[PDB]
Amino acid sequence: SKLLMIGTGPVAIQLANICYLKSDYEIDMVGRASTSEKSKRLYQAYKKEKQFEVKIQNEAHQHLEGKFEINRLYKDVKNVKGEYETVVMACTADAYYDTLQQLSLETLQSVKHVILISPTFGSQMIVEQFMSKFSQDIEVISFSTYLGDTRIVDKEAPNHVLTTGVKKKLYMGSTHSNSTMCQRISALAEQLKIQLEVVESPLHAETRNSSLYVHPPLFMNDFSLKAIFEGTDVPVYVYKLFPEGPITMTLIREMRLMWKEMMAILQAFRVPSVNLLQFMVKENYPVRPETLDEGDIEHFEILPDILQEYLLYVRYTAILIDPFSQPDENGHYFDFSAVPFKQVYKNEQDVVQIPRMPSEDYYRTAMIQHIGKMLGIKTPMIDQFLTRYEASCQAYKDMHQDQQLSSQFNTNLFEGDKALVTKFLEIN
Template identity: 55%
Template structure:
């Protein structure tokens, strides 16, 4: 790593920029979309108004190594500004700190000269198959480029004040994040360098055999579709609610019912069948939830039930998943107050549709990002011969709610997010990639 271009100007990009600048030999640049995004424009303005400084703070003292005030080498307001630079930089690493559905667009906005010189591309928040899309997209321009997929972003970073988006806070950090490379794990010097760099700031990166293996180790892929693509949640996201309701609460305070848990289990099984076709080890969903996301008390679930989860009967699996969500309604490890109240861990409100600066209605990242991810998984299933009736149900339900809302609210202007999408360009690249790999 030496010359690094980070695509994105959001809080994730700022935190990653800080991590990469802790290695003094690295030159780190960032690029935004100020012409098309008011958020990116505000970021660029704040950056220049505050002496071209960026800042990361942390919520918890144990994460102090991730915090600091720093400078990057250069911030480009737009992708076109890079190609117009008189002395164009030679970047060896591109970090895609943007949504997975934007990977094609970002790469296509970069000049061929930049693409041809890249040695590594890092996918920070991919879905299953994202590395195939990127690798196939570059098959003509840079066939040798190494693509590294993270399982997910390292934690939770957010802008605390919209007027200073160059200052962000990391409120939580995962115990570890998985990554996989299109190069052989043992031959990837870049992954070793990444591991050392992130270890220095207290983040453990675990190298897996393939990027597909890493991409499948994201619990959101398995739990977000049932949590967000049900009638209760979609109605709240589109129409609001008279009383506060929350993503992770049991019905009627939230969407979680036994029917939702049933759909979650079936979704997990369908993804498991797809992964088996692609030679990726299956995921023990309950163990992943409890051991790698949010733990529960030993008194709540036995270790035997957790480790043997995949061998249990379907109704037993659903019972355990329901118990798990019941157990984290409160933070079971928080200290109760004098009235016996624990921290209300599950009180995460739904974000609703909103109008952007151009007056166009937008869908929040959840569930739109989940719509993209789930569609890609559905299409991969079709390509490898796996039927996905539950995934189909999620996507049909989502599309029905969106179309009904648009039909009933002709007073609004809508972004393309409100159109039914099949992400054909992404799917065609995956299809070509799988065809080439099989030969």
């Protein structure tokens, strides 16, 4: 009956309101004031009001809203004490190891379920193999992604969050198929009117995230890396065609290549393949019927390479605008494409950070490359993504020796994570 929610951002707050309203757990939340002025403001805001709040924008999302209190807000991970049956990881996947390893032995021994909200491919392996030293029968559950889009409207009230959208479909896998915990989650999803497909394993669920296949090619190319680390003369945009953004036949090829390296790896683990195009058009964002042939979408996996590339290119071109938005009087639709790149920035202690795009893709990609090695699968496209990213970080260090830089600029990170994946795969 105790739950530990690791994270104090909007994801954590939204999940905590679901637990508060729909579970029997006492909820403790854990931030990190030590390492973060964002966590600190959140702690200060909660201390003052003694309430969090979730608002919604589309009334379709009733179930998710509410004001609530938790049992305890911990300032930092090291402060956690006692026993918790269930740990929810609502942080970034590149912190799961580093975070859990700050928990006490006593805490770590009490845990029966770890729930990964936004895992990468291999996260369940890391977390299972880590937590194995302390429980013998730890249940690990992975979602495909967080359930929607939540944010803070007002930075000075970060305990008030707004859920703007919910996903059409999530996937969930457990290390313990059809467990009590799976069934409760299923029953909860059905109340929140969120479609949830249960799959065979956590790894299966981790591969039904389109950002896996799409973000590395979009962000880890020289156009994007320049725009992130050096900037440009006029704004450029993530989803636009060259020269307005990175998209190009070269990029789409790299995406196909990466997707195929990935599909080799999944064949090794015996996980079904991902029809990328179908996934994008039937699950992410729709296009008009005239844009793509229903057969091409359905049979995408057996079509010739060049055709797969063409269809991917077309999908991206079809969403330069929102083709379902109301066009204005001159026939112009909403500019859906115009998402700027986040640049490296200085936090409030003058430390230079690399934004989540592409920091977290360096992580996802480094994990996939390390799993590729361990299985003897080749990964030459992944390799090149990593090399490019490492080259930009090295260029940044060389170019800005005055400046104080985060440890995201360092090599090589993730040794701990990689060692746990090595171990897990030796056993099986």
